[PDB]
């Protein structure tokens, strides 16, 4: 009985492979052959924000391109000001172990989550001038790995028990549960039109979900190990993935298959974070080799290096208007490159 | 070229910095430990005199020294992802059960995986061997045999140089020394020397267990101090 099921599954998989192969006539590299290179770039650190006393685990640029929030291991979540390197708020957390934070699009909420399996929401703008906890969303069975705001009243969470959830803040209970993965879910990314998001887990497979129904639409497998970060192209029809094999990959949704890869021989370490530029011509990256790289999005030619840290880089971010790039690391310092 | 509001904001930032300095300085006085045991090992009954599904915490103080011990019971069988956080702790505590002979190889494989990890090449490990009285009762019973599971126990070298406990059945000493040497062999096979292991023996009802941890954390810190003064 079950063997017949496995047989039809294998036949359908082979048919899918043939169907996805049939559409590949000419690759991306042979098309972009005649393009003037972007030349060479070099950026110098413009600022340095100090004040943390432990490792930094996450950050998130504000929507007004001036404010940002950072989360540390010592248990404090603090908000900075980029231009005048001041401090606006410092929030003491209940649990010291914190691995993810998110900053609301409206500008008056923040979210926090870690090993305690609870996502906590803090409200910023209120009377009496202190930050107080609004909600403590619980219902997961593994460590929270990522969280993102959809609207002012909706949040999506990716946990470490092979599942993702969509919540309603006021009600305080889940309304949709995405469960297709088989390994730990590590990364999550939304889309500009706010209708579908992508997820990446430890079983070396990325998935394209839908926010309304709750059904998987496409799955992509092209990696040899677990993936640690994911980004999404500004156009809305492509994305880039990074694993700990020192190989980044670019995938297209409509073609349903891989397009191009970025890799080299001198680098054999893992990748911790990726991000695209405003026009999409460049691709940032963060390695365990105590530095960062800059890849061309069309040619896979290393066109710059940013090295100012002594420990590994944990978080990377690009401003909405494309003016600066912020990088944090494990030496309690995060820097701004322009 | 600076308004009054900017000056007030700068004063606010300086006050926040002062508070952060004080709070961070206060926290360093305590020491940190990670307790992890496979199963059927009684890791809960290690220190009982002195004493949130994802994280469990236990605080105990000896000689004014404060120790925070973290035990995690809400995670899965695979622990390769949430262990990167614990790379700044003082020492890891490992607890096994030597009474049961069916699951010793699993414990050895777990210890080998932990010892040869990538983010734990500077963290030394304290090892405990729990439930020794059951071991004694089982070995004097004469039903279970070690040659069936471990073929090298049949031909063994007498531990004459080592000092056995004063007054004891030689068979018990032979078996327990073989078991301990089994773990110490895995400990020393790499032979790197960056970190070392401290084996111990523990009974079911023992009142003193914080003293052993204290006089081992002291040795760990002494080794670090000897290393960073260029004396070694």
């Amino acid at each position, epitope marked *: 009985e079950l063997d017949q099921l496995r047989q039809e599954a294998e036949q359908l998989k082979n048919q899918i492979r043939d169907a996805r192969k049939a559409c590949a006539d000419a690759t991306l590299s042979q098309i972009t052959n005649n393009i003037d290179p972007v030349g060479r770039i070099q950026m110098r650190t413009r600022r340095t924000l100090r004040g943390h006393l432990a490792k930094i685990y996450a950050m998130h640029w504000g929507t007004d391109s001036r*404010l940002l929030v950072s989360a540390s291991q010592d248990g404090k979540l603090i908000i900075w000001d980029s231009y005048t390197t001041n401090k*606006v708020h410092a929030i003491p957390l209940r649990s010291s172990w914190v691995m993810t934070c998110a900053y609301a699009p409206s500008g008056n909420y923040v979210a926090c989550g870690g090993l305690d399996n609870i996502c906590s929401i803090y409200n910023l703008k209120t009377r*009496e*001038g202190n930050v107080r906890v609004s909600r403590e969303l619980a219902g997961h069975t593994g460590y929270l790995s990522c969280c993102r705001f959809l609207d002012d009243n909706q949040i999506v969470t990716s946990s470490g028990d092979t599942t993702c959830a969509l919540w309603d803040i006021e009600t305080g209970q889940q309304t949709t549960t995405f469960t297709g993965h088989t390994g730990d879910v590590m990364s999550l990314s939304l889309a500009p039109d706010t209708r579908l998001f992508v997820s990446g887990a430890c079983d070396a497979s990325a998935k394209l979900w839908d926010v309304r129904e709750g059904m998987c639409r496409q799955t992509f497998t092209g990696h040899e190990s677990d993936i640690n970060a994911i980004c999404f192209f500004p156009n809305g029809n492509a994305f880039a993935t990074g694993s700990d094999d020192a190989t980044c990959r670019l995938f297209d949704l409509r073609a349903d298959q891989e397009l191009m890869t970025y890799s080299h021989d001198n680098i054999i370490c893992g990748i911790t974070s990726v991000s695209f530029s405003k026009s999409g011509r460049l691709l940032l990256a963060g390695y365990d080799d105590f530095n960062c790289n800059v890849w061309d999005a069309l040619k896979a030619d290393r066109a710059g290096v940013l090295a100012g840290h002594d420990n590994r880089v944990s978080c990377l971010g690009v401003t909405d208007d494309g003016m600066a790039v912020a990088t944090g690391s494990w030496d309690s310092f995060l820097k701004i490159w322009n | 070229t600076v*308004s009054a*509001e900017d000056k007030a904001a700068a004063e*606010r930032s300086k*006050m926040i910095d002062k508070n952060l300095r004080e709070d961070g300085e206060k926290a360093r006085r305590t020491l940190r430990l990670l307790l992890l045991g496979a199963d059927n090992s009684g890791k809960s009954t290690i220190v009982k005199q002195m004493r949130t599904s994802g994280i469990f915490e236990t605080k105990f103080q000896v000689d004014k020294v404060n120790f925070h011990m973290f035990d995690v019971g809400g995670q899965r069988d695979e622990r390769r992802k949430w262990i990167q956080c614990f790379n700044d702790v003082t020492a890891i505590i490992f607890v096994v059960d030597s009474s049961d002979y069916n699951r010793l190889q699993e414990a050895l494989n777990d210890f080998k995986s932990i010892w040869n990890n990538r983010w734990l090449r500077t963290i030394s490990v304290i090892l405990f061997l729990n439930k020794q009285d059951l071991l004694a009762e089982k070995v004097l019973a004469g039903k279970s045999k070690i040659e069936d599971y471990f073929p090298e126990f049949a031909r063994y070298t007498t531990p004459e140089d080592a000092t056995p406990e004063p007054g004891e059945d030689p068979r018990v000493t032979r078996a327990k020394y073989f078991i301990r040497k089994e773990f110490v062999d895995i400990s020393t096979a790499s032979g790197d020397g960056r970190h070392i292991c401290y084996p111990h023996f523990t009974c079911a009802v023992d009142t003193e267990n914080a003293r052993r941890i204290f006089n081992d954390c002291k040795d760990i810190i002494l080794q670090m101090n000897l290393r960073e003064y260029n004396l070694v």
Partner: single-chain antibody
Amino acid sequence: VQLVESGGGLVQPGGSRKLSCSASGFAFSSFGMHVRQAPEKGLEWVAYISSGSGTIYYADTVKGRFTISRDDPKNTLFLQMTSLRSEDTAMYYCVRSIYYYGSSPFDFWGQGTTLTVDIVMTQATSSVPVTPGESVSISCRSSKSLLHSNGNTYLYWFLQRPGQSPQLLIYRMSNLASGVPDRFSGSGSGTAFTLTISRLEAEDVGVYYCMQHLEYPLTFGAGTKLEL
């Protein structure tokens, strides 16, 4: 969030007095504190105490004989007055303010207690007859430019109802306060500022003031009275 005051009464010249302002309902140590009104004149600034008692300012008219202190665990502050004159009869208010990026200072005003014994800002209009259901506008002129290098124009609009304490309406010339209906609006350019009210109706008749906050001391306007 409430402020209460104790002190006052008839005082002979050459004496001394102490006024006490107590707060209840908010975090008192995070805020900075500040204002008197003559019987038939607009508001005038007096003195300022910072948070943590790290900065104190006094006005030139009141320099040398006035002291301000604060008790944080008790959540109170005191003003001690010595060597009074015959021109110091007024009513005194207790005001809070907090300064960071995007904040709204001067957002709350106390009741005020009566006691009986530089940038020049001018407001032209004194009394304007208005018809209900009609839009109105008010102007406020300035002597030197208030626009700063970074692009912020520091100017505040205050409304005072009859027999009440004033409340904030517009801060930094464009934004709106909390709980203020959207009918009010403000606009202008360098050294020219206007407040516009559309679909005007009842309960909005009072006295309006324009204040600058570019540098100390802080100078108010002459005021404007609305009549039916």
